[PDB]
Design a protein around this ligand. Structure first.
Ligand SMILES: [Mg+2]
Ligand SMILES: [Mg+2]
Ligand SMILES: [Mg+2]
Ligand SMILES: [Mg+2]
Ligand SMILES: [Mg+2]
Ligand SMILES: [Mg+2]
Ligand SMILES: [Mg+2]
Ligand SMILES: [Mg+2]
Ligand SMILES: [Mg+2]
Ligand SMILES: [Mg+2]
Ligand SMILES: [Mg+2]
Ligand SMILES: [Mg+2]
Ligand SMILES: [Mg+2]
Ligand SMILES: [Mg+2]
Ligand SMILES: [Mg+2]
Ligand SMILES: [Mg+2]
Ligand SMILES: [Mg+2]
Ligand SMILES: [Mg+2]
Ligand SMILES: [Mg+2]
Ligand SMILES: [Mg+2]
Ligand SMILES: [Mg+2]
Ligand SMILES: [Mg+2]
Ligand SMILES: [Mg+2]
Ligand SMILES: [Mg+2]
Ligand SMILES: [Mg+2]
Ligand SMILES: [Mg+2]
Ligand SMILES: [Mg+2]
Ligand SMILES: [Mg+2]
Ligand SMILES: [Mg+2]
Ligand SMILES: [Mg+2]
Ligand SMILES: [Mg+2]
Ligand SMILES: [Mg+2]
Ligand SMILES: [Mg+2]
Ligand SMILES: [Mg+2]
Ligand SMILES: [Mg+2]
Ligand SMILES: [Mg+2]
Ligand SMILES: [Mg+2]
Ligand SMILES: [Mg+2]
Ligand SMILES: [Mg+2]
Ligand SMILES: [Mg+2]
Ligand SMILES: [Mg+2]
Ligand SMILES: [Mg+2]
Ligand SMILES: [Mg+2]
Ligand SMILES: [Mg+2]
Ligand SMILES: [Mg+2]
Ligand SMILES: [Mg+2]
Ligand SMILES: [Zn+2]
Lengths: 206, 97, 83, 60, 116, 97, 127, 155, 23
RNA sequence: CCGGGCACUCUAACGGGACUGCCCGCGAAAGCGGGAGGAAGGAGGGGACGACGUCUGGUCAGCAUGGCCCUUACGGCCUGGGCGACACACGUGCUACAAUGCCCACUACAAAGCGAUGCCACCCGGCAACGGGGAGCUAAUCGCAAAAAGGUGGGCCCAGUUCGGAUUGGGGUCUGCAACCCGACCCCAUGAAGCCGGAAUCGCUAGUAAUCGCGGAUCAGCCAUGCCGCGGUGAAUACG
């Protein structure tokens, strides 16, 4: 085990923090806990909508939870029934002026957090893992990516002897700093244990 | 007539120090240019592994950058258009006299 | 040791029984889990069972042992050498 | 015995000496930082994710 | 056997030579020559007989020394070993007294190694 | 001297003495056995006897495995002997030319 | 009229001010022989002008800040070695081949995890 | 090293005689990077050389260097099944290095209490052909001659 | 040396002050 | 320090800069040696960064998670004790065995950091640890802060010592509800081993090794001589 987090390895060069706000020493932990509590409920709820990233900004007394997603209406609801329902339950935790936006994901098959979750959904549905992994890679490359790599590790197919299966097409240069690489992880929970799913998408250099 | 700007990302800390020494400059009169104060560097060093392997670490830093600006010739025409200011989210302004 | 500016510490709950016995014309065997409590001259002559973590050790208190703590007289580690 | 100990650390104690910091994420008692309320593992986990404002990998 | 019962070394300075007495260190070397007004640099070989008996007298009447200091230190260790306190037991075994670890080291109190 | 570690098992002073008596077979070669260290442990398939020993002419590192623990100890010795006899005689091989 | 150079070493910065005169030298409110009193490495500072015969031609006003006394001394050496160049362009000859008009980047190497120092590794027993 | 030769570090001349060899001698005296002490001991001895013997410290110091340079030495080598002391010529770099090393090492064997006294006196004796330093150079040379019969193994 | 509390050099080592290292 | 100023130093953001680009030569070429310019030259020095895989490596005790197992107890609260035990054995370190040293007094020269029940100037009491006053600083402002080795002068005189600072007696400080087990520090006294270390073995190729001090995280305090950083002084050697 030896590979650096390819997002944490690009914070501030190719990627941008999911919680962007200044805060002095006596407050950092207090807001930081909020973002985590905020994200805990949200990733549970907006799961069914295709959640990808949750940007969080703060000024003073307020906080603007921007949410990117594949199916926007599943968050909004009918006219705004669910989107207003969220801010309601949201302001209980926030205890303050918690705005909430929703953002369209252009191609969900170019978002690594999404293809990872879909793979994890397939293997939970008792799908042929190796064939599934090749499908995801094929869906990402057909959608215009310049390279993709998907990894699935654990009791694949339910065998006692754990195994690591992966597939890749095109270019995934994990050492290149200027290379825009999206990364996402999902956690297929099976009757016999956990399988970890990693997805790499190469969107091009800069 | 003092405005202090603290923030983590220096791209927003500088672009916001520009949009004051530009705004109050036109609105008259004297603005003493943004002075980059030294950065205060919080440091975090942790073992990469969750168990033993004591001799492998990763270095993290949190950078509280600092800027100071003097709008030297106040004029309450400046101290009005600044009241509604489009400062990015990740910046903190302090204003004293 | 403990700052002279502060007081001579006794748990005050152990100390209550000492004075209630002195008045009544003491004594009776006092069970305590107070090793931290200083011996004080009101205790001289009594016998107090001090918990070492396992047993309460009956210790008789004399004139010479007053500045100490009750734990110093109920050792906690059974040891008789090796071999 | 651990979740009963994550709760006992939140309670205020009889004496202010028994105050000890835990992880507000995993309940870890050791290598827990004051600035984050996070242990050294969650610290590296979230920071790698990007969910710590300003925090970045330091190389010099 | 001059002062104070120890024939303190000549050839050396008085402040040094006084330290060759049980109970007089550097701190009491600075003290004894201040009260009796003697240059602490003067060698014992050059003490005037008045300076000697002046330095002898203050030294012996102010502090407990050699023999009597040894008796008290012993008597204190004896009674600690008699009331049966924790510091007493460690003296009844030769084991250390100030909380030090004994799994390793502790060879000053234990003595050179006892092979098994 | 010689140290014996029983990892995640418990053993008697008798078994520790057996190991010392078996390691004594290495004394045959009349070379210095410098801080010999035996590790005993149990896998799901049987016992594992590890050993690290330095001598004036190199190190001995061997691992024995077997259902029966005394046999795993003996397999360890057999591997240790062939390593020691190699360390002691290999230099003799190229005396000519 | 006045002649200035910037001299930097390990963590020392030295601002030298050359002024024609007899040779008196001032470093931080003191005379040279008073500030570097007892240091043998000191005389090495005045060397760039022994390469161009300015032994007593100039006087020295010199500030000093950061690092240690020898790095300051060497920073000074680079300082005046630059002020003479602006006093005469044709001083690269008989100063640049003498290594005087350059600054060595030899600086403390960073402490690194795993090691006791920059490179000194912890002791271990292989067996 | 394996890939290429190593480049000999040039030393800046000292600031009392302008000598690069005098510098290397100071460094050999230097313990714990206390160069100020190192220089002071040498020069302190350069006064003692002058005051016990009225002539040039620089000249005395340099002659004692030539008096400790070993012209040949033995360099081991295993030939078949025997370790042979092969006689070998010493490069001038190494001659210098051995000279300075033995000077200090032999000086610090001396009984004189203050170091600069030991550095002066040893350089005084070695300037004339005496002292444990020059002995060490003679001893090494006699070893090389004693083994001239093995001089054909030289590499 | 540094292990000697009763000297300045020992107090510099410990990181404390006293009669043998005043403030 | 006031006036005045951004020159300089600095601070911190954006750039320029080095490419075998030029010259000499060997080359089929790629490159190699040598030269000039230059602050830097052939990856400029250090960093971050670790391929498919290996060790059925490590971690169910950071977290997650399959399954097996406990349910007035294999769960939960508490007081106390233990994790600090000590015939021994190994690993890592600290301090040393002294004069290129030890002590005292005086006197310079850093960097990176940290600091609103926090950092504490300065005053007073105490030999001191520290205590009582009390100003400043949301901190390039005020503070921790003295850097130490070094420099000057004086003591020591080769001795188990003015080396070494273990061990123990007695007396105090402080944190803390509480220092018996089991805290750090101060003061008096005690003043051990150790006279440079067998077999064997570690590190380091340049601002490195060696040596000197400073800071931080954890933290009421602290068993830190540990760890992660920071600068000061500053070597030896590489035939192969
Ligand atoms: Mg380590
Ligand atoms: Mg239990
Ligand atoms: Mg749990
Ligand atoms: Mg605590
Ligand atoms: Mg904690
Ligand atoms: Mg004495
Ligand atoms: Mg202890
Ligand atoms: Mg103990
Ligand atoms: Mg053993
Ligand atoms: Mg066992
Ligand atoms: Mg193994
Ligand atoms: Mg056999
Ligand atoms: Mg800088
Ligand atoms: Mg001078
Ligand atoms: Mg260093
Ligand atoms: Mg190791
Ligand atoms: Mg040498
Ligand atoms: Mg010799
Ligand atoms: Mg001769
Ligand atoms: Mg001493
Ligand atoms: Mg300018
Ligand atoms: Mg080349
Ligand atoms: Mg690379
Ligand atoms: Mg678990
Ligand atoms: Mg489990
Ligand atoms: Mg089942
Ligand atoms: Mg306990
Ligand atoms: Mg433990
Ligand atoms: Mg044993
Ligand atoms: Mg041993
Ligand atoms: Mg240690
Ligand atoms: Mg050791
Ligand atoms: Mg050491
Ligand atoms: Mg701190
Ligand atoms: Mg002695
Ligand atoms: Mg002896
Ligand atoms: Mg002594
Ligand atoms: Mg005591
Ligand atoms: Mg305690
Ligand atoms: Mg001696
Ligand atoms: Mg030494
Ligand atoms: Mg050997
Ligand atoms: Mg190398
Ligand atoms: Mg030293
Ligand atoms: Mg420190
Ligand atoms: Mg602390
Ligand atoms: Zn955690």
């Amino acid at each position: 085990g030896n590979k650096i987090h390819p997002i944490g390895f690009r914070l501030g060069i190719t990627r941008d923090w999911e919680s962007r706000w200044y805060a002095g020493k006596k407050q950092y932990r207090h807001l930081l806990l909020e973002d985590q509590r905020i994200r805990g409920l949200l990733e549970k709820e907006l799961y069914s909508a295709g959640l990808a990233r949750v940007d969080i900004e703060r000024a003073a007394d307020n906080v603007a939870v921007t949410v990117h997603v594949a199916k926007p209406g599943v968050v909004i609801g009918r006219g705004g029934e669910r989107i207003r329902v969220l801010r309601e339950e949201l302001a209980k935790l926030t205890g303050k002026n918690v705005a909430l936006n929703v953002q369209e994901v252009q191609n969900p098959n170019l978002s690594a957090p999404l293809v990872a979750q879909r793979v994890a959904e397939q293997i939970e549905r008792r799908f042929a893992v190796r064939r599934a992994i090749k499908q995801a890679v094929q869906r990402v490359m057909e959608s215009g990516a310049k390279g993709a790599k998907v990894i699935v590790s654990g009791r694949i197919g339910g065998a006692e002897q754990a195994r690591t299966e992966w597939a890749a097409q095109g270019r995934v240069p994990l050492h290149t700093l200027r290379a825009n690489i999206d990364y996402g992880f999902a956690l297929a929970r099976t009757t016999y244990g956990v399988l970890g799913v990693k997805a790499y998408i190469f969107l091009g250099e800069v | 007539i003092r405005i202090k700007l603290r923030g983590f990302d220096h791209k927003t800390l500088d672009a916001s120090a520009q949009k004051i020494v530009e705004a109050a400059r036109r609105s008259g009169a004297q603005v003493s240019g943004p002075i980059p104060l030294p950065t205060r560097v919080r440091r975090f060093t942790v073992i990469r592994g969750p168990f033993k392997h004591k001799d492998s670490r990763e270095h993290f830093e949190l950078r509280t950058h600092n800027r100071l600006v003097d709008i030297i010739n106040p004029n309450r025409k400046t101290i009005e258009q600044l009241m509604t200011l489009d400062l990015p989210t990740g910046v903190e302004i302090e204003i004293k006299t | 040791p403990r700052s002279l500016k502060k007081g001579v510490f006794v748990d005050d709950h152990l100390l209550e029984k000492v004075l209630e016995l002195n008045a009544k014309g003491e004594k009776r065997l006092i069970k305590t889990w107070s090793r931290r409590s200083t011996i004080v001259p009101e205790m001289v002559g009594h016998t107090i069972a001090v918990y070492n973590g396992k047993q309460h050790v009956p210790v008789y208190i004399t004139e010479n042992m007053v500045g100490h703590k009750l734990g110093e007289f109920a050792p906690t580690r059974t040891y008789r050498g090796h071999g | 015995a651990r979740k009963a100990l994550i709760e006992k650390a939140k309670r205020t104690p009889k004496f202010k000496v028994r105050a000890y910091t835990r992880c507000v994420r995993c309940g870890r008692a050791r290598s827990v930082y004051r600035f984050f309320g996070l242990c050294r593992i969650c610290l590296r986990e979230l920071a790698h994710k990007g969910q710590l404002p300003g925090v970045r990998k330091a190389s010099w | 056997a001059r002062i104070a019962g120890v024939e303190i070394p000549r050839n050396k300075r008085v402040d040094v030579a006084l330290t060759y007495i049980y109970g007089i260190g550097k701190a009491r070397a600075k003290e004894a020559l201040e009260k009796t007004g003697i240059n602490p640099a003067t060698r014992v070989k050059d003490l005037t007989e008045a300076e000697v008996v002046r330095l002898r007298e203050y030294v012996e009447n102010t502090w407990k020394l050699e023999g009597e200091l040894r008796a008290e230190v012993a008597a204190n260790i004896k009674r600690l070993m008699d009331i049966g306190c924790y510091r007493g037991l460690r003296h009844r075994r030769g084991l250390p007294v100030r909380g030090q670890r004994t799994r390793t080291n502790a060879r000053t109190r234990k003595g050179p190694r006892k092979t098994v | 001297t010689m140290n014996i570690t029983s990892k995640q098992m418990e053993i008697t002073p008798a078994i520790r003495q057996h190991v010392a008596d078996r390691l004594a077979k290495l004394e045959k070669w009349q070379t210095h056995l410098i801080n010999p260290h035996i590790i005993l442990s149990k896998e799901p398939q049987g016992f594992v006897a590890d050993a690290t020993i330095n001598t004036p002419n190199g190190v001995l590192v061997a691992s024995g495995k077997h259902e029966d623990m005394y046999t795993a100890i003996n397999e360890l010795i057999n591997k240790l002997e062939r390593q020691l006899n190699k360390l002691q005689h290999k230099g003799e091989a190229r005396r000519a030319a | 009229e006045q002649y200035y150079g910037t001299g930097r070493r390990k963590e020392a910065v030295a601002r030298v001010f050359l002024r024609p005169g007899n040779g008196k030298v001032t470093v931080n409110g003191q005379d040279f022989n008073e500030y570097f009193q007892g240091l043998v490495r000191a005389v090495a500072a005045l060397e760039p002008l022994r390469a161009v015969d300015a032994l007593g031609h100039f006087d020295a006003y010199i500030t000093v800040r950061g690092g240690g006394k020898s790095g300051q001394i060497d920073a000074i050496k680079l300082g005046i070695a630059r002020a003479l160049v602006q006093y005469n362009p044709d001083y690269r000859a008989k100063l640049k081949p003498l290594g005087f008009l350059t600054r060595d980047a030899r600086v403390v190497e960073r402490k690194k995890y795993g090691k006791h120092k920059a490179r000194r590794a912890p002791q271990y027993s292989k067996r | 090293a394996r890939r290429r030769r190593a480049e000999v570090r040039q030393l800046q001349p000292d600031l009392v005689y302008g000598d690069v060899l005098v510098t290397a001698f100071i460094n050999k005296i230097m313990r714990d990077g206390k160069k100020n002490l190192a220089a002071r001991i040498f020069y302190d001895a350069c006064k003692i050389i002058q005051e016990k013997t009225g002539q040039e410290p620089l000249k005395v110091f340099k002659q004692a260097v030539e008096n400790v340079k070993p012209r040949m030495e033995v360099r081991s080598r295993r030939v078949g099944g025997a370790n042979y002391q092969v006689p070998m010529e010493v490069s001038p770099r190494r001659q210098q290095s051995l000279a300075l090393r033995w000077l200090v090492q032999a000086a610090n064997q001396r009984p004189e209490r203050r170091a600069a006294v030991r550095i002066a006196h040893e350089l005084m004796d070695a300037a004339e052909g005496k002292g444990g330093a020059v002995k060490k150079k003679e001893d090494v040379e006699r070893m090389a001659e004693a083994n001239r019969a093995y001089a054909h193994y030289r590499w | 040396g540094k292990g000697d509390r009763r000297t300045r050099r020992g107090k510099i080592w410990r990181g404390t002050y006293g009669k043998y290292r005043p403030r």
